[PDB]
Design a binder for these strands. Structure first.
Ligand SMILES: [Mg+2]
Ligand SMILES: [Zn+2]
Lengths: 170, 7, 54, 72, 141
RNA sequence: AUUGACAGAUUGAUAGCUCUUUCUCGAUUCCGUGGGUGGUGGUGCAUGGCCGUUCUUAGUUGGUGGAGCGAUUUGUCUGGUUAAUUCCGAUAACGAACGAGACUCUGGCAUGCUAACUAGUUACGCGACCCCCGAGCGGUCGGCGUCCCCCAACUUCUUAGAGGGACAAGUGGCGUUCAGCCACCCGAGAUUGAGCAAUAACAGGUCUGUGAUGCCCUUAGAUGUCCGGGGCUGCACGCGCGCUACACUGACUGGCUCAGCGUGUGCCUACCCUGCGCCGGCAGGCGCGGGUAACCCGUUGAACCCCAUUCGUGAUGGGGAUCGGGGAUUGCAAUUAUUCCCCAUGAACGAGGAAUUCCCAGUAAGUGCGGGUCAUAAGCUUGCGUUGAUUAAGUCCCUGCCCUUUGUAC
């Protein structure tokens, strides 16, 4: 890689973190996966997995972690010992909009009420502490045609530059 | 009746 | 057999140029060789580095 | 620049070059009178025009225009 | 005086006349049977186009040094009209002025540069300046 | 149990796919019964995702008070104003909140700062010259270097970090003297353009965007995957956006003077931008290099534009549709011509009835040139430029949206 241009390097790098971010979304469905932050160093890069069920992430002395370093090394063209992975816990789970989604998804898989789980995942946010939230579920449920309903309370601004970084969406 | 001029 | 199966030359082929997630042969983008559909980049643009400031 | 743009760029250049020299090295009373004469003739000799090219917006060949469309 | 304080059109015409009077510029075999530009629909209207274009080329080389075949073709481009299709841009031709720069080499007014291209020699610069002075003198009187 | 094959015939196939001949690998297959597969098949009237329109206008929701038996309403209003329930005022509303606004992206500036050889400026010691006595602190150089150097610094012009400046601030007028509207002076600019953009309604479109998907459908004579050829362009006729011009402000020939956004050698993927020099009438070919990039193209010498000659109202060198011949281009391949270069035939085209669309300032428009597309490519599209004016600062007359009063078994 002694002859690489910056523009195509960052283009392959942006899709590099996107490829792992999407893959770990598909992989750690039951581990409460939220996202990944990548630190790049010439010697040995490290990658952190943000999830709520970090104990299940390890499994058995990091069985899932060790098997993950092997597939990443084999697939992404990295040498032995060049990429190391760590597991972290979400500081404020309620304010991680991905978390309340993956709790709702498994509630839908279980068969919980549409309104009660929307208000339950809702009511969990102000007790953690938030200014506003809005969760919308649309589609078909034990019937014909697809219905969309929303559940929002509190100060909840959609329009403006502040909505770019103050709002996290899944 | 288009406001051309300025009873 | 081996002289017929996939015997069509794979180089210089548009359809043979396919995105690495969607495997679609209509509307491929190759800027910086991105190998990414226009709509598939539509959804991952905030991930790669593209944000609609303008 | 261009052709009319470059001529005016040069024309405004010598005008404010004389003004700057008449400001720094000679009597400022003459600097006021030459500036007043320049403003009286045409203000554009000293001011840079703010107006620039306006970015095109999709839906029509020009920036403000629209691609002619019919209902049927 | 330099070549800047004289009319460009009259300077080119005077240099073309001077080249015709000398008659030592190399003349290719294809004299009056080829087009000067790709975009053109006709042959050159007037003769001595070889001398007139060589006169202008020597002037462009005077202003900017280190110019080769690629540089020249960008300069002399012409408005290519393709009839029904929208018109586009066409670069200048290549071979004909290669005989011009070989003609200038034969007349000892261009010299190959250190990295590429052709650069004005003292003989060429001196000739261009004296004809410029003659042009200025003729314009004044 | 199998898979593959030379030989002779078909099939286009140097396709053991078949017919005669036999060879070669070996538990990995094959034959029936259950059972997943794949689909660019159908359903967008199952959908999830999104975008768009009502809508980019000015419009929508609690706590506490007021009106109500109540579902609910006032809060959001006679009036004035703005692009804008924004603001101001009479007022049962006060505090607020969503949406405008506000915020974010690019261009407008100090002789302000920081410092930029990957850039320039002024000079320095040169050389090439021009006039001329040896002339002159003469005039040009994008010709040399001021990162192994003392052989100097700086950022005005080339851009990248941070800060104010423009808020109806100051004068005058209109205005219930309030909100607001206009003239004016100083001012880079007295309305500079764009992204996000409240709930919700679309049976809006996409299953041909994904290994997102429900159900049904052909599954070993598959609607899969594999190969090849043909058409997606066909052609009597009508419909949308568009290009070329119908000329004299024109076109032809020759010269002269200016450009920025921006891509430029790739995991699987071979395929990059091009410079210099030579050959060829032209597309083009050959040898030599630079660039993984403010370092090369490139000071991007682009086009009408500025100058000189010709044609002079003649369907007239211009308008160039259709056809022939020759050649290189790209790949395996160009015929049902990707495209390009030269000689050719050279029809309409005197500005076009209704009837509509877009456009108010760097605007329209001319006119090009980048990127998206790509083995090669644009009459598409997004943008960047150069030239670049008048029309108006108004209303609902024609077509439609918003608000209220609101008939209404809806
Ligand atoms: Mg595709
Ligand atoms: Zn793909």
């Amino acid at each position: 890689a002694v002859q690489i241009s910056k523009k195509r390097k960052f283009v392959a790098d942006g899709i590099f973190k996107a490829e792992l971010n999407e893959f770990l979304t598909r992989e750690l469905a039951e581990d409460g996966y939220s996202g990944v932050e990548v630190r790049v160093t010439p010697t040995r890069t490290e990658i952190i997995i943000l999830a709520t069920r970090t104990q299940n992430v390890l499994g058995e002395k990091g069985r899932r972690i060790r098997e993950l370093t092997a597939v990443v090394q084999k697939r992404f063209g990295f040498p032995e010992g060049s990429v190391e992975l760590y597991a972290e816990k979400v500081a404020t789970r309620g304010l991680c909009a991905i978390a309340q989604a993956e709790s709702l998804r498994y509630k839908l898989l279980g068969g919980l009420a549409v309104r009660r789980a929307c208000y339950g995942v809702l009511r969990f946010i102000m007790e953690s502490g938030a200014k506003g939230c809005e969760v919308v579920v649309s589609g078909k449920l034990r019937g014909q045609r697809a219905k969309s309903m929303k559940f929002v309370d509190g100060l909840m601004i959609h329009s403006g530059d502040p909505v770019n970084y103050y709002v996290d969406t899944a | 009746s288009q406001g051309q001029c300025t009873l | 057999h081996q002289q017929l199966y996939w015997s069509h030359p794979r180089k210089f082929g548009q359809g043979s140029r396919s995105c690495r997630v969607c495997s679609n042969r209509h509307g491929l983008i190759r800027k910086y060789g991105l190998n990414m559909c226009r709509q598939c980049f539509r959804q991952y643009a905030k991930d790669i580095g593209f944000i609609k400031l303008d | 620049g261009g052709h009319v743009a470059q001529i005016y760029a040069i024309r405004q250049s010598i005008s404010k070059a004389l003004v700057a020299y008449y400001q720094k090295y000679v009597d400022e009373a003459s600097k006021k009178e030459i500036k007043d004469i320049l403003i009286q003739y045409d203000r554009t000799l000293l001011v840079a025009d703010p107006r620039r090219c306006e970015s095109k917006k999709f839906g029509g060949p020009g920036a403000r225009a629209r691609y002619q469309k019919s209902y049927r | 005086v330099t070549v800047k304080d004289v009319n460009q059109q009259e300077f080119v015409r005077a240099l073309a006349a001077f080249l015709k009077k000398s008659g030592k510029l190399k003349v290719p075999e294809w004299v009056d049977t080829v087009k000067l530009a790709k975009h053109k629909e006709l042959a050159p209207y007037d003769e001595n186009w070889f001398y007139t274009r060589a006169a202008s080329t020597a002037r462009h080389l005077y202003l900017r040094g280190g110019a080769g075949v690629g540089s020249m073709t960008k300069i002399y481009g012409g408005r290519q009209r393709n009839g029904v299709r929208p018109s586009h841009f066409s670069r200048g031709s290549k071979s004909v002025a290669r005989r011009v720069l070989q003609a200038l080499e034969g007349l000892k007014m261009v010299e190959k540069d250190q990295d590429g291209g052709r650069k004005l020699t003292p003989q060429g610069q001196r000739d261009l300046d004296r004809i410029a002075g003659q042009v200025a003198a003729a314009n004044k009187k």
